[PDB]
Design a protein around this ligand. Structure first.
Ligand SMILES: *[C@@H]1O[C@H](CO)[C@@H](O)[C@H](O[C@@H]2O[C@H](CO)[C@H](O)[C@H](O[C@]3(C(=O)O)C[C@H](O)[C@@H](NC(C)=O)[C@H]([C@H](O)[C@H](O)CO)O3)[C@H]2O)[C@H]1NC(C)=O
Ligand SMILES: [Cl-]
Ligand SMILES: [Cl-]
Ligand SMILES: [Cl-]
Ligand SMILES: [Cl-]
Ligand SMILES: [K+]
Length: 756
């Protein structure tokens, strides 16, 4: 199944097809390789129905429609518009020669009579008028031309990035799993021996498969994390292709937009200064080299825009001016913010009326924008559905499904139901999450159709999901169960012979207490662009602590992690060596003019981290009362590394608009590897440290309070990922802030709370 591209919840419209019963995907794949009546380009497998659909079409020739109980598997060769070697196995759609002449059909005998046709060579894929290599020609794929004067000619086809690489290897698809020094690559899905933020589920379009060398972070060339415990990562020796790189789109010798497509010959700045050659390091040293930007055309000293600036620019030959924009003669999309409500949104009926900001699925996947056709091509547009409210990447129900859904950013999963509950307005008859462990008595589908018994084989026959085949699944009578971890939750086979299965609405079990990282007041979610942050909504960060002096002044921040425990920075408690000199304020919004019902607790014990890091544990003299305004924060799993580009929040009062009020600021997490680059922190950031802030457009201020929280949203809650420490490094211009990585101290924190 390495020769296939899989997509869950995807199906195509097929004319040339063959349907048959199959027990597995592998069994269905074997029938596709057989090629009985036609050449199988894709197959569909229905796990609950045990049905196998073999097809002659794929996404290039057929329309994609979302469906339940389906995984679409497409043969990689029929999707790849590139060649490997002499293009013997090439199956792309290039239908013109290297000189622009349209190809003749392999089945046609006019203007030329073929020597190679589907009749003479049936295993050579001589389809339509596509360029092919059926005669082992060393010059590569060719075609018979429509020109009667030219019998046949070779075609210009891009080389696959399998044997070699183009540019920086950002689109490298080869199988090299060894570094330049001979170390074995660590699998991208693995967090051992090295914990990292390049999580494939968080970057599903970056092709981080197995332990292959990849370039997901604009590095010089593909690299990987190593299996050696002492070497975190290393570059790979990937060969460069000798053939031209992929097309960067239309090129203009005049200014258009930002000038990223500008390829003119202007070698003078806006102030008349002579441009410094991109290949030169005098009088100015830089990393905007042809080696770092190989497909950006940094040739000679011509004005270019490789790093995404305002207009095409160049370095200056004058020692005083480093760089300046160029006066080029003019000629006449990013990821949306995380606005998923932490106070879980609800839907009425089928959720067609739902207009909330949720963009999270039941498995924690990110919703694709309705205006976007990538990674999933669809027709669910605001033009086709004007009353469905298909705005941004929000969870909606345009085609009247059981509940709100969205297309996912994961190319291997077309769509998923959203993480929303049915509005409330047997109590024990409830479930947790998707309800795999659910053993209740509900047997009513969303449509009202009665459930078929699990042991029953009529109207639907099934060799899977019977009490004998799944004995730990609790498949009793016709009760709605989730034995396969279905996204839509518990389901049952239906008594309707026209409907295989259907979902049953099972409510979520009510939380008996205020669980960690779940505020009772929805956070404002201050946009990242905002200067000096925003004033937080009162009680939207219930774990926020105010460390107070014996004269009642707020000096430091902190996080409530347990009713008797507060996590802060060691720097905060440097001045005084007594826990009696510090007091903890909980459920506050005001820095000075504290509102009534705020919790004031004395500190009884202080625990400093043994490896001398800027992190400290405070034991409260009495346990804090957990209310709707005072809730602890969740701690991450030991050594967890927050994914790169993850938007996090830093909260506190700070030193000062909104005087003496609790503030918040959104910061993107920068992976230690990117953070440790010579242009930024230059190898100073250790595994015990976290990088958050902007690499371009720095605020130039020590944000929040010292010891303050850094929380990151994950599916349905906020997890404490960092502790504010100004000593490590403040948010400078073009330099991110350095925070204490909480996950590296979780084992120590757990030990202290357990034994004290
Ligand atoms: C991508 O990242 C940048 C930060 O680097 C965010 O600002 C950006 O949001 C959009 O940023 C642009 C500025 O470039 C505008 O502020 C934008 O608004 C508009 C637009 O004119 O581009 C307004 C328009 O009404 C929107 N359409 C709606 C609401 O239906 C479009 C639309 O959202 C966008 O074109 C889709 O790409 O945007 C901010 O949306 C980040 N991108 C997103 C989608 O948030
Ligand atoms: Cl669809
Ligand atoms: Cl991605
Ligand atoms: Cl207050
Ligand atoms: Cl690193
Ligand atoms: K690069």
């Amino acid at each position: 199944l390495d020769d296939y591209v899989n997509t869950q919840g995807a199906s195509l419209f097929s004319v040339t097809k063959k349907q048959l019963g199959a027990g597995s995907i592998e069994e269905c794949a074997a029938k596709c390789e057989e090629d009985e009546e036609f050449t199988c380009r894709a197959f569909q497998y229905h796990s609950k129905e045990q049905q196998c659909v073999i097809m002659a079409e794929n996404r290039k020739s057929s329309i994609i429609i979302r469906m339940r109980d389906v995984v679409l598997f497409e043969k990689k060769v029929y999707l790849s518009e590139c060649k490997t070697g002499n293009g013997k196995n090439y199956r792309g759609t290039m239908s013109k020669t290297k000189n622009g002449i349209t190809c003749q059909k392999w089945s046609s005998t006019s203007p030329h009579r073929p020597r190679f046709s589907p009749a003479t060579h049936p295993s050579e894929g001589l389809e339509e008028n596509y360029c092919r290599n059926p005669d082992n020609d060393p010059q590569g794929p060719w075609c018979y031309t429509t020109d009667p004067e030219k019998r046949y000619d070779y075609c210009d086809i891009l080389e696959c990035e399998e044997e070699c690489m183009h540019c920086s290897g950002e689109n490298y698809d080869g199988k090299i799993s060894k570094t330049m020094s001979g170390l074995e690559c660590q699998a991208w899905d693995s967090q051992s021996p090295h914990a990292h933020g390049y999580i494939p589920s968080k970057f599903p379009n970056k092709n981080l498969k197995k332990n292959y060398c990849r370039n997901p972070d604009r590095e010089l060339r593909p690299w990987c994390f190593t299996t050696d415990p002492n070497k975190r990562w290393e570059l790979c020796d990937i060969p460069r292709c000798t053939t031209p790189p992929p097309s960067s789109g239309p090129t203009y010798q005049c200014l258009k937009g930002t000038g990223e497509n500008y390829r003119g010959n202007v070698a003078v700045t806006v102030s008349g200064h002579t441009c410094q050659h991109w290949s030169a390091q005098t009088p100015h040293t830089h990393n905007r080299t042809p080696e770092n930007f190989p497909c950006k055309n940094l040739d000679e000293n011509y004005c270019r825009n490789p790093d995404g600036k305002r207009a095409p620019w160049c370095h200056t030959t004058n020692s005083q001016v480093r760089w300046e924009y160029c006066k080029i003669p003019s000629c006449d999309p990013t990821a949306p913010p995380e606005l998923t409500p932490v106070v879980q949104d609800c839907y009425h009926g089928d959720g067609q009326s739902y207009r909330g900001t949720s963009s999270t699925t039941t498995t924690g996947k990110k919703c694709q924008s309705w205006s976007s056709m990538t990674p999933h091509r669809h027709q669910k547009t605001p033009e086709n559905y004007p009353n469905a409210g298909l705005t941004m990447n929000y969870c909606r129900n345009p085609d009247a499904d059981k509940g709100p859904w969205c297309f996912t950013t994961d190319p291997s999963v077309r769509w998923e139901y959203c993480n929303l509950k049915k509005c409330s307005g047997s109590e024990e008859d409830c479930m947790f999450g998707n309800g795999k462990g659910y053993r209740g008595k509900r047997a009513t589908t969303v449509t009202g159709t009665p459930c078929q018994d699990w042991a029953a084989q009529e109207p639907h026959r099934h060799s899977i999901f019977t009490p004998e085949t799944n004995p730990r699944a609790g498949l009793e009578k016709n009760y709605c169960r989730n034995p396969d971890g279905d996204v839509g939750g518990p389901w049952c086979y239906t008594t309707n012979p026209r409907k295989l299965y259907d979902y049953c609405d099972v409510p979520q079990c009510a939380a008996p207490s205020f669980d960690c990282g779940k505020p009772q007041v929805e956070p404002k979610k201050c946009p990242g662009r905002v200067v000096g942050g925003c004033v937080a909504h009162p009680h939207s960060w219930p774990w926020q602590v105010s460390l107070r002096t014996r004269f009642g002044m707020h000096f430091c921040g902190g996080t409530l992690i347990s009713p008797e425990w507060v996590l802060t920075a060691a720097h905060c408690l440097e001045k005084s060596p007594r826990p009696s000199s510090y007091k903890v304020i909980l459920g506050a919004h005001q820095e000075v003019n504290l509102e009534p019902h705020v919790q004031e607790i004395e500190v009884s014990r202080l625990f400093l981290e043994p490896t001398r890091k800027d992190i400290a544990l405070l034991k409260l003299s009495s346990p804090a009362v957990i209310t709707d305004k005072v809730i602890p924060a969740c701690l991450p799993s030991p050594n967890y590394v927050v994914a790169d580009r993850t938007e996090c929040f830093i909260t506190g009062w700070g030193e000062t608009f909104g005087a003496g009020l609790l503030k918040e600021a959104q910061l993107p997490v920068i992976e230690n590897k990117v953070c440790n680059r010579y242009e930024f922190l230059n190898g100073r950031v250790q595994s015990t440290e976290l990088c958050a802030g902007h690499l371009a457009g720095g605020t130039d201020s020590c944000q929040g309070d010292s010891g303050g929280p850094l929380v990151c949203f994950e599916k349905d809650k906020y997890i404490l990922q960092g502790v504010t420490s100004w000593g490590l490094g403040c948010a400078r211009p073009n330099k991110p802030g350095v925070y204490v990585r909480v996950s590296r101290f979780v084992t120590w924190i757990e030990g202290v709370m357990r034994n004290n």
